Amino acid sequence: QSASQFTDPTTGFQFTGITDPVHDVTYGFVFPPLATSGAQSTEFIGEVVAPIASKWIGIALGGAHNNDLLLVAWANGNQIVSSTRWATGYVQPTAYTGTATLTTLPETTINSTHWKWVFRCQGCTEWNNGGGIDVTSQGVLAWAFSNVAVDDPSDPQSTFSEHTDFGFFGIDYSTAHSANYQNYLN
Numbered sequence: 001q002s003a004s005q006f007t008d009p010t011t012g013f014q015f016t017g018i019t020d021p022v023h024d025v026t027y028g029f030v031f032p033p034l035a036t037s038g039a040q041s042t043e044f045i046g047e048v049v050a051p052i053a054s055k056w057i058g059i060a061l062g063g064a065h066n067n068d069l070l071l072v073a074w075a076n077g078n079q080i081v082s083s084t085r086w087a088t089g090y091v092q093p094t095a096y097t098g099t100a101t102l103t104t105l106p107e108t109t110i111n112s113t114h115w116k117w118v119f120r121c122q123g124c125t126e127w128n129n130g131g132g133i134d135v136t137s138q139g140v141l142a143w144a145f146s147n148v149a150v151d152d153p154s155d156p157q158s159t160f161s162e163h164t165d166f167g168f169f170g171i172d173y174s175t176a177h178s179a180n181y182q183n184y185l186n
Protein backbone atom coordinates (compact mmCIF):
# COMPACT_ATOMS: atom_id res chain seq x y z
CA GLN A 1 0.00 0.00 0.00
CA SER A 2 1.15 3.61 -0.51
CA ALA A 3 0.90 6.63 1.84
CA SER A 4 -0.62 9.94 0.80
CA GLN A 5 -1.09 13.45 2.20
CA PHE A 6 -4.16 14.29 4.28
CA THR A 7 -5.38 17.02 6.64
CA ASP A 8 -6.86 16.13 10.03
CA PRO A 9 -10.17 18.03 9.81
CA THR A 10 -10.30 19.09 13.48
CA THR A 11 -6.71 20.02 14.25
CA GLY A 12 -5.68 21.11 10.72
CA PHE A 13 -2.45 19.10 11.11
CA GLN A 14 -1.15 17.83 7.71
CA PHE A 15 0.12 14.21 7.68
CA THR A 16 1.42 11.62 5.32
CA GLY A 17 0.01 8.17 5.81
CA ILE A 18 -2.79 5.70 5.23
CA THR A 19 -6.08 4.33 6.49
CA ASP A 20 -6.12 0.55 6.76
CA PRO A 21 -9.62 -0.39 5.40
CA VAL A 22 -9.86 -3.63 7.42
CA HIS A 23 -9.68 -2.12 10.91
CA ASP A 24 -10.25 1.44 9.76
CA VAL A 25 -7.20 2.76 11.53
CA THR A 26 -5.53 5.93 10.20
CA TYR A 27 -1.73 6.33 10.56
CA GLY A 28 -0.16 9.72 9.90
CA PHE A 29 3.39 11.12 10.14
CA VAL A 30 4.80 14.60 9.71
CA PHE A 31 8.43 15.78 9.94
CA PRO A 32 10.13 19.10 10.65
CA PRO A 33 11.68 21.02 7.75
CA LEU A 34 14.59 19.42 6.01
CA ALA A 35 17.89 21.05 6.95
CA THR A 36 19.70 23.15 4.34
CA SER A 37 22.95 22.39 6.21
CA GLY A 38 24.10 19.82 8.78
CA ALA A 39 22.17 16.92 10.20
CA GLN A 40 18.42 16.34 9.89
CA SER A 41 16.12 16.57 12.92
CA THR A 42 15.56 13.21 14.63
CA GLU A 43 12.02 13.91 15.72
CA PHE A 44 8.58 13.67 14.14
CA ILE A 45 4.93 13.90 15.01
CA GLY A 46 2.44 11.15 14.41
CA GLU A 47 -1.12 10.07 14.94
CA VAL A 48 -3.13 6.88 15.22
CA VAL A 49 -6.92 7.28 14.79
CA ALA A 50 -8.45 3.98 15.80
CA PRO A 51 -11.91 2.66 16.51
CA ILE A 52 -12.35 1.68 20.19
CA ALA A 53 -12.46 -1.98 19.10
CA SER A 54 -8.70 -1.57 18.46
CA LYS A 55 -7.24 -2.88 21.69
CA TRP A 56 -3.59 -2.12 20.92
CA ILE A 57 -1.82 -0.69 17.92
CA GLY A 58 1.86 -0.87 17.04
CA ILE A 59 3.95 1.13 14.57
CA ALA A 60 7.15 -0.37 13.32
CA LEU A 61 9.46 2.45 12.28
CA GLY A 62 11.58 0.33 9.96
CA GLY A 63 8.75 -1.88 8.72
CA ALA A 64 9.56 -5.03 10.69
CA HIS A 65 8.98 -6.87 13.93
CA ASN A 66 12.77 -7.18 14.55
CA ASN A 67 15.72 -4.75 14.81
CA ASP A 68 13.75 -1.53 14.63
CA LEU A 69 12.08 1.00 16.93
CA LEU A 70 8.49 0.11 17.76
CA LEU A 71 5.82 2.35 19.15
CA VAL A 72 2.95 0.77 20.95
CA ALA A 73 -0.19 2.33 22.29
CA TRP A 74 -3.64 1.62 23.61
CA ALA A 75 -6.50 3.45 25.28
CA ASN A 76 -7.11 2.76 28.96
CA GLY A 77 -10.28 4.73 29.73
CA ASN A 78 -9.65 8.42 28.86
CA GLN A 79 -5.87 8.08 28.75
CA ILE A 80 -3.46 6.83 26.06
CA VAL A 81 -0.84 4.42 27.41
CA SER A 82 2.18 4.20 25.15
CA SER A 83 5.71 2.84 25.01
CA THR A 84 8.83 2.43 22.84
CA ARG A 85 9.84 -1.20 22.24
CA TRP A 86 12.34 -3.39 20.51
CA ALA A 87 12.53 -7.08 19.52
CA THR A 88 14.78 -9.74 18.07
CA GLY A 89 13.83 -13.26 16.95
CA TYR A 90 10.02 -12.75 16.75
CA VAL A 91 9.15 -12.57 20.43
CA GLN A 92 7.35 -10.20 22.74
CA PRO A 93 8.93 -6.77 22.15
CA THR A 94 10.44 -5.32 25.38
CA ALA A 95 11.19 -1.80 26.53
CA TYR A 96 13.52 0.07 24.19
CA THR A 97 16.76 1.08 25.88
CA GLY A 98 17.69 3.92 23.55
CA THR A 99 17.00 7.63 23.57
CA ALA A 100 13.46 8.08 22.29
CA THR A 101 10.87 10.13 24.11
CA LEU A 102 7.21 9.67 23.17
CA THR A 103 5.05 12.56 24.33
CA THR A 104 1.24 12.55 24.00
CA LEU A 105 0.25 15.90 22.45
CA PRO A 106 -2.81 17.84 23.67
CA GLU A 107 -4.70 17.25 20.38
CA THR A 108 -5.07 13.65 21.53
CA THR A 109 -8.80 12.90 21.81
CA ILE A 110 -10.70 9.92 23.10
CA ASN A 111 -14.43 9.86 22.29
CA SER A 112 -17.21 7.26 22.35
CA THR A 113 -16.18 5.60 19.02
CA HIS A 114 -12.45 6.33 18.47
CA TRP A 115 -9.16 7.11 20.12
CA LYS A 116 -6.97 9.64 18.37
CA TRP A 117 -3.42 9.49 19.61
CA VAL A 118 -1.36 12.46 18.54
CA PHE A 119 2.27 12.20 19.54
CA ARG A 120 5.73 13.62 19.36
CA CYS A 121 8.56 11.14 18.97
CA GLN A 122 11.92 12.70 19.83
CA GLY A 123 15.09 10.82 18.87
CA CYS A 124 12.96 8.41 16.89
CA THR A 125 14.70 8.55 13.51
CA GLU A 126 18.05 7.16 14.78
CA TRP A 127 18.26 4.11 17.06
CA ASN A 128 20.83 2.83 19.46
CA ASN A 129 21.67 -0.15 17.26
CA GLY A 130 22.94 2.32 14.63
CA GLY A 131 19.88 1.96 12.41
CA GLY A 132 17.05 4.32 11.70
CA ILE A 133 15.18 6.09 8.98
CA ASP A 134 16.36 8.36 6.28
CA VAL A 135 13.95 11.32 6.15
CA THR A 136 15.06 12.40 2.67
CA SER A 137 14.17 9.11 0.95
CA GLN A 138 11.49 6.48 0.38
CA GLY A 139 10.91 3.70 2.92
CA VAL A 140 8.46 1.22 4.42
CA LEU A 141 6.45 1.52 7.62
CA ALA A 142 4.36 -1.22 9.22
CA TRP A 143 1.54 -1.39 11.71
CA ALA A 144 0.36 -4.15 13.95
CA PHE A 145 -3.14 -4.56 15.33
CA SER A 146 -4.91 -6.58 18.00
CA ASN A 147 -8.57 -6.83 18.99
CA VAL A 148 -7.49 -8.39 22.34
CA ALA A 149 -6.60 -6.26 25.40
CA VAL A 150 -3.07 -6.18 26.76
CA ASP A 151 -2.45 -8.15 30.02
CA ASP A 152 -2.36 -5.00 32.18
CA PRO A 153 -3.60 -1.77 30.60
CA SER A 154 -2.31 0.53 33.36
CA ASP A 155 1.30 -0.68 32.78
CA PRO A 156 3.03 0.95 29.75
CA GLN A 157 5.39 -2.06 29.77
CA SER A 158 2.56 -4.62 29.86
CA THR A 159 2.95 -7.87 28.07
CA PHE A 160 0.34 -8.87 25.51
CA SER A 161 -0.30 -11.47 22.92
CA GLU A 162 0.73 -11.45 19.26
CA HIS A 163 -1.02 -9.11 16.88
CA THR A 164 -4.04 -10.52 14.97
CA ASP A 165 -3.07 -8.55 11.85
CA PHE A 166 -0.22 -6.46 10.52
CA GLY A 167 0.40 -4.52 7.31
CA PHE A 168 2.88 -2.38 5.41
CA PHE A 169 2.99 0.84 3.52
CA GLY A 170 5.42 2.77 1.36
CA ILE A 171 6.20 6.36 2.33
CA ASP A 172 8.12 9.10 0.57
CA TYR A 173 9.70 10.79 3.57
CA SER A 174 11.01 13.61 1.34
CA THR A 175 7.42 14.82 0.96
CA ALA A 176 6.37 14.32 4.57
CA HIS A 177 7.96 17.53 5.96
CA SER A 178 5.92 20.54 7.06
CA ALA A 179 6.69 24.22 7.54
CA ASN A 180 3.98 24.17 10.21
CA TYR A 181 5.77 21.60 12.41
CA GLN A 182 6.78 24.23 14.99
CA ASN A 183 3.15 25.38 15.15
CA TYR A 184 2.05 21.79 15.79
CA LEU A 185 4.37 21.73 18.84
CA ASN A 186 2.79 24.95 20.26
Ligand code: HEM
Binds near residue numbers: 064066091144167
Ligand atom coordinates in the same frame (compact mmCIF):
# COMPACT_ATOMS: atom_id res chain seq x y z
C1 HEM B 1 3.77 -10.74 21.95
C2 HEM B 1 3.70 -9.83 20.96
C3 HEM B 1 4.21 -10.23 19.57
C4 HEM B 1 4.51 -11.41 19.04
C5 HEM B 1 4.53 -12.82 19.66
C6 HEM B 1 4.86 -11.18 17.64
C7 HEM B 1 5.27 -12.15 16.77
C8 HEM B 1 5.40 -12.01 15.42
C9 HEM B 1 5.57 -13.08 14.47
C10 HEM B 1 5.64 -14.60 14.76
C11 HEM B 1 5.67 -12.50 13.28
C12 HEM B 1 5.80 -13.22 11.94
C13 HEM B 1 4.35 -13.46 11.43
C14 HEM B 1 4.30 -14.06 10.00
O1 HEM B 1 5.08 -13.62 9.09
O2 HEM B 1 3.48 -15.01 9.73
C15 HEM B 1 5.58 -11.06 13.46
C16 HEM B 1 5.59 -10.15 12.43
C17 HEM B 1 5.54 -8.81 12.55
N1 HEM B 1 5.42 -8.15 13.76
FE1 HEM B 1 5.15 -9.02 15.55
N2 HEM B 1 4.81 -9.84 17.37
C18 HEM B 1 4.42 -9.24 18.53
C19 HEM B 1 4.27 -7.89 18.67
C20 HEM B 1 4.58 -6.98 17.66
C21 HEM B 1 4.59 -5.53 17.84
C22 HEM B 1 4.24 -4.90 19.18
C23 HEM B 1 4.87 -4.96 16.67
C24 HEM B 1 5.03 -3.48 16.15
C25 HEM B 1 4.82 -2.50 16.97
C26 HEM B 1 5.07 -6.04 15.75
C27 HEM B 1 5.39 -5.81 14.43
C28 HEM B 1 5.46 -6.81 13.49
C29 HEM B 1 5.55 -6.55 12.05
C30 HEM B 1 5.62 -5.18 11.35
C31 HEM B 1 5.64 -7.89 11.43
C32 HEM B 1 5.72 -8.18 9.94
C33 HEM B 1 7.10 -8.03 9.29
C34 HEM B 1 8.08 -9.01 9.86
O3 HEM B 1 7.98 -10.24 9.58
O4 HEM B 1 8.98 -8.58 10.60
N3 HEM B 1 4.92 -7.27 16.36
N4 HEM B 1 5.38 -10.80 14.77
Ligand SMILES: *[C@@H]1O[C@H](CO)[C@@H](O[C@@H]2O[C@H](CO)[C@@H](O)[C@H](O)[C@H]2NC(C)=O)[C@H](O)[C@H]1NC(C)=O
Binds near residue numbers: 049114116
Ligand atom coordinates in the same frame (compact mmCIF):
# COMPACT_ATOMS: atom_id res chain seq x y z
C1 LIG C 1 -14.66 10.62 17.47
O1 LIG C 1 -13.46 11.01 16.80
C2 LIG C 1 -13.35 10.66 15.43
C3 LIG C 1 -12.01 11.13 14.87
O2 LIG C 1 -11.84 12.56 14.94
C4 LIG C 1 -14.51 11.32 14.66
O3 LIG C 1 -14.56 10.74 13.35
C5 LIG C 1 -14.19 11.77 12.37
O4 LIG C 1 -15.09 12.88 12.27
C6 LIG C 1 -14.68 13.93 11.37
C7 LIG C 1 -15.69 15.08 11.46
O5 LIG C 1 -15.35 15.89 12.55
C8 LIG C 1 -14.66 13.36 9.95
O6 LIG C 1 -14.43 14.34 8.94
C9 LIG C 1 -13.71 12.16 9.87
O7 LIG C 1 -13.89 11.54 8.61
C10 LIG C 1 -14.01 11.14 10.98
N1 LIG C 1 -12.94 10.17 11.08
C11 LIG C 1 -13.21 8.89 11.22
C12 LIG C 1 -12.00 8.03 11.43
O8 LIG C 1 -14.37 8.43 11.20
C13 LIG C 1 -15.85 10.97 15.28
O9 LIG C 1 -16.92 11.54 14.57
C14 LIG C 1 -15.88 11.22 16.78
N2 LIG C 1 -17.10 10.65 17.31
C15 LIG C 1 -17.90 11.28 18.15
C16 LIG C 1 -19.08 10.51 18.72
O10 LIG C 1 -17.70 12.43 18.45
